[PDB]
Design a protein around this ligand. Structure first.
Ligand SMILES: Cc1cc2nc3c(=O)[nH]c(=O)nc-3n(C[C@H](O)[C@H](O)[C@H](O)COP(=O)(O)OP(=O)(O)OC[C@H]3O[C@@H](n4cnc5c(N)ncnc54)[C@H](O)[C@@H]3O)c2cc1C
Ligand SMILES: Cc1cc2nc3c(=O)[nH]c(=O)nc-3n(C[C@H](O)[C@H](O)[C@H](O)COP(=O)(O)OP(=O)(O)OC[C@H]3O[C@@H](n4cnc5c(N)ncnc54)[C@H](O)[C@@H]3O)c2cc1C
Lengths: 581, 583
C-alpha cells in the first residue's frame, strides 16, 4: 500500500518527496510517480554539441536571489540551491561592456512596424518610435510606461499587500475584475495599447488578472537574475536523488521513484486507511515522445495524495473529488498559455560584431523575441571554441500560430562543426527531442533572425532544438490567474481543495509566483507546514513569507485603506513623470 | 416503438435532412429530428430588437451569394430552396446606393488603423495615407486586391482550378494545403503587408492559419459581390423547414411527435437489436431565457436504425460513443480549427452614420471593436414603422479566448431607455431583450466609447437597446470552422458523410463542407448524403449543373501528371492587367 503518493516529477513533487522522506520516511511509505522518463517537468536543461558549458534551458532559466532582509526575492530557490550546494551564475540581461559605462541593453535591438531602433531610442529619440502614441505617453520606454499606468491607477500599488491590492478599485470595479487589457485600453491610447502589446511575448497576459500582471516591472536589466551552471533541471534532479539517497526508510531508494506512470484515475475505496484507489497506467518514452502502453490497471492504494501537477494534468485525471463544485469552478481559475522555444547554434557569436551580447531584441516578425545566450570559450574553463547559443524564440501564444506550423516537411540534419569533426557524427549534431525541428523552420527562423539584425546573410547554424508546451500533459507552459477570480483565497485553499479529503495539489499554477519555480516551491513548502506538519527548514529564514496573506471574503464595502507614507509616494510618482518630460 | 432514422441536431443541416426524407421515404420509415434547446435554426438566429421590428439582427447567419446563370457558381442550394419553400429575400447591402448617379459603394467606408483615419478609396486614391511600410511592389493594392496579387503570384488562375487541381499546386516546393494561410503570406508579403492584411480583410482576427486552398480564393467579400438575406431573418429557412417537416401528410408518425426538442444526445451505443444497433441515451434539457441546462430526470433511450448527425465539431465531440474510436474518425475530427465568434448589436433612434456619409458595409480599426457594420433604419424598410430607429452590428471580432469581448461580460446589466417611438408599447424592463448572454452597463459604455472614436466623434446619441451573443459555448465551442493544413479536405469532405461504413451513422454540417461558415456548406453536405447513402434523387428546384461537392483529387498526390494549362494567352494577360491597376 502507500501513506503518501506524490504525483509529479517537477520542482513541486521532487521537493515534496525529499522533505518528507528526509523527515518521516522511516515512519511513512512515500513514492513519487512520473509520466515521462525525465525528472524536471517544465524544468528541462540540455547541453548541445560544441557547447558543453552553454546550457540550453528548454524550461526555466533564471531566479531572483534573496535580499539581506531575506523578505524579498525568490528566497526558497536561492537558499534551496544553498543547502543542495549546486553552483550559480549571473544570468546576464545586458552588456557589461564597457565596464567604464556598461551600455546594459540600451544598445539592444527593436524591430516593429518595419522600423528599427534601440532601447535607448525610446527616451533618447522618441521620434524614432513608429507608434502614434499620445503626448502624455511619448518619452517613456514600455517597462517605464507600465509603472506610469500603475501609479496613475493608484500610487503605491506595488508596495501594497495582496490583501490591500484586492480592495483597490479603478473606474468603479476592483482591479482584479479587470483583465490586463480591459484596463490598458481605458488608461492608455490605442496606439499605447497596441504598442505595449507588440513590445512586451505577445501573449504577455492575454487578459490575466490585473492585480498579478500590473507590477510585472522586474523584466528590467536593472534587476538581478541567477541561473544554475549545471542547468535549472539540476535542482529537481538533485531533489529526486537525495529523496532515494535517504539512508534508511520503510521503502528503499531503488523503489522510491516510479517513472513512465500516468495516474489515469483517483477512485474512492472503502479502506479507511487507504481510501484512494490510484489507477496508474504504463507509458514509454521514445526520444522524449511519451505514449501509452496497454494492459491497463496498476492500482496502488494511498492514504494521502500530493498532485505536483499543472491545471491540464489535473484536468486529465478523472476523480469524483473534482466533482466537488469548488474544485470544479476553481480548476478553471487560471489560464494555460502555450510556450514555444527554438535554439540555434553557430561557430560564431556574430551578434557581438553588432554591439549585442546578452538580453533580448523584440520584433513584429513571427520570431518576436530573440535572446543572446553565450559563447563556449567565454564560459569559465570551458572548451576553446567560439561556438555560441541563440534562444531566438521565447514566443508563447495560444492556438495555431507560425511556430506551431512549419514543424513539418523534412527534418534538420545540420552540419558538423570543425570543433566536432573529430568527435561526433552528423546524425547526432541535431539532437533527438520530443519535437524534431525541420529544414524548413530553421531556414525561415534564420531568414527572420537576419532581418531583425539588419544583415544580408548570417553564418548558418549547425545544431538547433525546437520544443513546445502545448501538449498534454501540460497544455501550456505557464499559468496566469483569470480576472473576476479571487486569486488571494484560491492560492490558500487549492492546497486542500476539499476538507474531508486528504488530497493535496501544489504547483506554480495555483501559486502567487506564477510562471516561476519560486511559485511551485512556496506552495509545496507552505502545504507541508500548514497540513503535513513538517517544520520550517534551517536553510529557509523565519522572515520569508511563503504564500501572501489573503484578503477577507467580504470585500463588498471594505474599510478604507489607510495610507501611511503618502508623502514619499506622491513625491516619487511626480519625480517619475519628469523622466518622460 | 423504434425509429428508422434519427436526425440529431436541429441546425439548417438537420432540418433540411428530415424534411426531404419524410417528404419521400417518411410513410416508408419512422423519421424524427432531435433538438438540444427551445429553438430551431441553430446558428441561424433571427431576433427583432424592440423598436426595430423590421431590422433583423441576425445573431448567427445573415446572407447568401445569389446563384449564377450557369448555376455551377453561387450558393445554388440556398438560393433555390428560398424560392421553393417561397421565402422573402431582400438585397444585403455592403455599399451605399447613394449617389444614384455615381454610387460610392464601400469606397467611403471608414478605416482607423495605427491611430490614422482613411477610407477604402484612399488605398487606390492616396496610398500615402496608409500608415504601413508596404514595400514598393505592394504599395497601392486594397486588402482584397492584394490577396489576389498573391494568389496569382502563386499559380496564376488558382481561383479557376477545381479543388482536385488546386490541391496539387505546390508553392516553394510544398503543397498549397500543407501551408497555413499566414505561414504562406509571411513568405510572399513584407512583414508590414503581412500585419496589414491581418488588420483588415474579410472577417477579423480570424482568417486563422487555415488550409491555403480554402482561404486564398476567399476574396469574395468585396463591394462588387451581390448578396441577399431573408426578409424574415435567416432563421426563417431552418424554421419553415422545421414546420414543413412536421407538415408532410404521408407519415407513419404525426407532426406532433416528429420534432422532439429539449432532447440532448449524450451517448450513441451499439445495441443488441440487430435491426437497431443504436441505443441513443438522451437527457432532458430546459431553456430559461436562452440558457439551456440539463434536467437530471432520466436518460430517455429511443431505438434507431440510423442517426443522421447534423452536428458541428464540438457538438459531435460531446457524444460518448465507441463510434468515435475508429482511428480515421479519431484523427479527422481535428481536421478543422474551432474559432469562437462574438457579436454586439446597438439600437439608436437616429442612424447618425448617414449624417457622416456611411450607409451599409463595414469599417475596420486597431480598436478592440475591430469591426462595425451599419445595418439599416426601421422606416427605410419596405412598409416598416415611421421611426428613425436603426441598428449597428459589431463585436464581430473572432478569436480564441480571453479577448476583450469576453472581458466585459460581468458587472450590472444594460436596461436601456424607452424610446419615444415605443412609449407605452413596451416597458424599460422589456426594451433590452433577455438573451443567453446579457450585455452589461459596462460593455455598452466601452463599445459606444469605442464606436465614437472610430467615427472621429465627440459624443454619439446613447443606444436604447443592445444584445451581446457568443458561440464559444458548448454545444458549439466556436462560431464557424476552418480547414486546418496538412489535411486532405477533398477526401474528408466525402468521407465525413460516412466515417464508418459497416455502421449506418452519417454526420452532416458546414463544419466539414467546402462552404465552411456558409449555410450552403450544411445544405450541400446533407443533400450529397441523402443522394448517395439514402438514394434520394436530385429534386426539381436544384439544377444538375451545380456540382454539390468538389472533385476529390486522387490519394496519389505523390508525383502525379502535371496540370496541362489552359488559355494562358488569356490567364497571364488578366494577371498582368491586374498588376497595372496597383501601378
Ligand atoms: C518557457 C518557460 C520558461 C520558464 N522560465 C522560468 C524561469 O526563468 N524561472 C522560473 O523560476 N520558472 C520558469 N518557468 C516555470 C517553471 O519551469 C515551472 O513553473 C516549474 O518547473 C513547474 O514545477 P511544478 O512541479 O509545479 O510543475 P511541473 O514541473 O509541470 O510538474 C508536473 C510533473 O507531473 C507530471 N505529470 C503530469 N501528469 C501526470 C500524471 N497523470 N501522472 C503522473 N505524473 C504526471 C509531469 O510530467 C511533470 O513531470 C518557465 C516555464 C516555461 C514554460
Ligand atoms: C457568426 C456567424 C455568422 C455566419 N454568417 C453566415 C452568413 O452570413 N452566411 C451564411 O451563409 N452562413 C453564415 N454562417 C454559417 C451558418 O451559421 C451555418 O451554415 C449553419 O448555421 C450551420 O448549420 P449546421 O447544420 O452545420 O449546424 P448548426 O446550425 O450549428 O446546428 C447544430 C445543432 O445541433 C444541436 N445540438 C448540439 N448538441 C446536440 C446534442 N447533443 N443533441 C442534439 N442536438 C444537439 C444544436 O442545438 C444546434 O441546433 C455564419 C455562422 C456564424 C457562427
Amino acid at each position: 500500500p502507500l501513506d503518501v503518493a506524490i504525483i509529479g516529477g517537477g520542482v513541486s513533487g521532487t521537493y515534496s518527496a525529499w522533505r518528507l522522506q528526509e523527515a518521516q520516511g522511516d515512519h511513512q511509505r512515500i513514492q513519487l510517480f512520473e509520466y515521462s522518463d525525465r525528472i524536471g517537468g517544465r524544468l528541462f536543461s540540455i547541453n548541445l554539441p560544441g557547447l558543453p558549458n552553454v546550457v540550453a534551458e528548454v524550461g526555466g532559466m533564471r531566479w531572483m536571489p534573496a535580499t539581506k532582509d531575506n523578505t524579498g526575492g525568490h528566497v526558497m530557490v536561492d537558499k534551496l540551491v544553498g543547502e543542495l550546494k549546486l553552483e550559480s551564475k549571473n544570468f546576464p540581461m545586458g552588456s557589461n561592456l564597457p565596464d567604464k559605462d556598461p551600455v546594459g541593453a540600451k544598445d539592444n535591438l527593436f524591430y516593429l512596424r518595419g522600423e528599427r531602433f534601440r532601447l535607448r531610442d525610446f527616451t533618447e529619440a522618441p521620434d524614432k518610435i513608429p507608434y502614434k502614441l499620445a503626448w502624455s505617453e511619448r518619452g517613456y520606454g514600455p517597462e517605464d510606461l507600465q509603472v506610469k499606468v500603475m501609479h496613475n491607477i493608484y500610487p503605491g500599488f506595488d508596495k501594497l499587500s495582496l490583501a490591500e491590492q484586492m480592495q483597490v478599485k479603478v473606474f468603479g470595479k476592483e482591479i482584479w475584475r479587470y483583465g490586463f487589457w480591459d484596463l490598458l485600453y481605458r488608461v492608455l491610447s490605442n496606439e499605447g495599447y497596441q504598442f505595449m502589446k507588440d513590445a512586451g511575448y505577445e501573449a504577455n497576459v492575454a487578459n490575466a488578472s490585473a492585480v498579478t500582471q500590473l507590477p510585472a516591472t522586474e523584466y528590467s536589466d536593472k534587476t538581478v537574475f541567477l541561473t544554475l551552471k549545471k542547468g535549472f533541471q539540476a535542482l529537481p534532479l538533485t531533489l529526486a536523488k537525495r529523496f532515494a539517497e535517504v539512508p534508511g526508510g520503510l521503502i528503499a531508494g531503488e523503489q522510491r521513484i516510479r517513472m513512465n506512470r500516468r495516474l489515469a484515475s483517483v477512485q474512492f475505496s472503502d479502506d479507511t486507511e487507504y481510501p484512494y484507489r490510484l489507477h496508474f497506467q504504463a507509458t514509454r518514452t521514445v526520444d522524449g515522445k511519451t505514449s501509452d502502453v496497454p494492459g491497463a490497471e496498476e492500482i496502488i492504494h494511498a492514504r494521502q495524495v500530493i498532485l505536483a501537477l499543472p491545471r491540464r494534468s489535473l484536468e486529465l485525471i478523472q476523480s469524483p473529488l473534482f466533482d466537488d463544485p469548488w474544485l470544479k469552478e476553481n480548476i478553471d481559475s487560471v489560464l494555460v498559455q502555450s510556450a514555444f522555444k527554438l535554439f540555434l547554434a553557430y561557430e560564431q557569436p556574430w551578434w557581438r560584431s553588432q554591439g549585442l551580447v546578452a538580453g533580448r531584441s523584440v520584433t513584429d516578425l513571427p520570431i518576436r523575441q530573440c535572446y543572446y545566450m553565450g559563447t563556449e570559450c567565454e564560459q569559465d574553463g570551458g572548451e576553446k571554441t567560439l561556438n555560441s547559443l541563440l534562444m531566438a524564440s521565447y514566443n508563447d501564444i495560444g492556438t495555431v500560430p507560425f511556430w506551431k506550423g512549419l514543424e513539418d516537411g523534412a527534418p534538420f540534419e545540420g552540419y558538423q562543426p570543425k570543433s566536432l569533426q573529430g568527435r561526433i557524427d552528423a546524425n547526432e549534431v541535431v539532437p533527438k527531442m520530443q519535437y524534431q525541428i525541420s529544414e524548413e523552420m530553421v531556414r525561415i527562423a534564420q531568414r527572420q533572425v537576419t532581418s531583425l539584425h539588419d544583415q544580408i546573410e548570417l553564418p548558418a547554424p549547425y545544431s538547433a532544438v525546437y520544443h513546445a508546451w502545448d501538449a498534454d500533459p501540460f497544455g501550456g507552459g505557464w499559468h496566469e490567474w483569470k480576472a473576476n477570480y479571487r486569486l488571494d483565497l484560491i492560492i490558500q485553499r487549492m492546497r486542500h481543495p476539499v476538507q474531508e479529503q486528504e488530497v493535496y495539489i501544489v504547483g506554480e499554477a495555483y501559486s502567487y509566483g506564477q510562471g516561476w519555480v519560486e511559485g511551485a516551491l512556496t506552495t509545496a513548502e507552505s502545504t507541508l507546514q500548514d497540513f503535513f506538519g513538517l517544520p520550517r527548514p534551517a536553510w529557509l529564514p523565519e522572515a520569508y513569507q511563503l504564500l501572501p496573506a489573503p484578503a477577507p471574503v467580504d470585500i463588498d464595502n471594505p474599510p478604507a485603506l489607510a495610507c501611511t507614507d503618502c508623502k514619499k509616494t506622491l513625491t516619487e510618482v511626480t519625480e517619475f513623470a519628469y523622466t518622460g518630460i
